[PDB]
Amino acid sequence: EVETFAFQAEIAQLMSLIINTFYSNKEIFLRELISNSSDALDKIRYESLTDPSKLDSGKELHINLIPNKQDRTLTIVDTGIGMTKADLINNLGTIAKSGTKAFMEALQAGADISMIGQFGVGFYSAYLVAEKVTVITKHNDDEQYAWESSAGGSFTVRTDTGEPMGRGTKVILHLKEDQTEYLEERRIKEIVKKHSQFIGYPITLFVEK
Numbered sequence: 001e002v003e004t005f006a007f008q009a010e011i012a013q014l015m016s017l018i019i020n021t022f023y024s025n026k027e028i029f030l031r032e033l034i035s036n037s038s039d040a041l042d043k044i045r046y047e048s049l050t051d052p053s054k055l056d057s058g059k060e061l062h063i064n065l066i067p068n069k070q071d072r073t074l075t076i077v078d079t080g081i082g083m084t085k086a087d088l089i090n091n092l093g094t095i096a097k098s099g100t101k102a103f104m105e106a107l108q109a110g111a112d113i114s115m116i117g118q119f120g121v122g123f124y125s126a127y128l129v130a131e132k133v134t135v136i137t138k139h140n141d142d143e144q145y146a147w148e149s150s151a152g153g154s155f156t157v158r159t160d161t162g163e164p165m166g167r168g169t170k171v172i173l174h175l176k177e178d179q180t181e182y183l184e185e186r187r188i189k190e191i192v193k194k195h196s197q198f199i200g201y202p203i204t205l206f207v208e209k
């Protein structure tokens, strides 16, 4: 059972802008996704200060970067608070609507794509380097879901049958053919040290086989 939804017109417009605009500084996608992971990890850590049982699905708070040249995927895994089904369909899209509008206005005033995170829609910077994005997520109050979109105006949501995560979010970047440099270890290290050197959680860069 796969459910297909339409993006809001404004969100689809943002995705087309990111995909079509000529912009060479693509490497900032990693900074945005790492920052999204750090924000979700902050949330579950704060919630556990008043409720230790919220960590029953995993005490570790960390971020993993997993490149896979065989599948041509780059995966950003965090053990943060995760996302409910309403998040995937309604809540994050409500927030992204006003953030997109502010992002569009700033761009016409001289801002560039690298400041996308200041408007709360940094996730969509993933489409600078990815033709398809899959998001596996598990919230303490909901089931494990798989979100997916190759842009084009629609996204799908399904109950995930893969390996259970416990809690957190898994963002799988199906990279474009000419963006395979972000599967190389030295490139990922250089980007992490350049834009994410002070993240308050351990970032483990997996290496390939």
Ligand SMILES: O=C1NC(=O)[C@@H]2CC=CC[C@H]12
Pocket: 083, 087, 088, 089, 092, 093, 096, 123, 135, 147
């Ligand atoms: O992680 C994510 N952030 C988003 O804005 C996008 C839509 C909602 C949930 C899945 C994606």
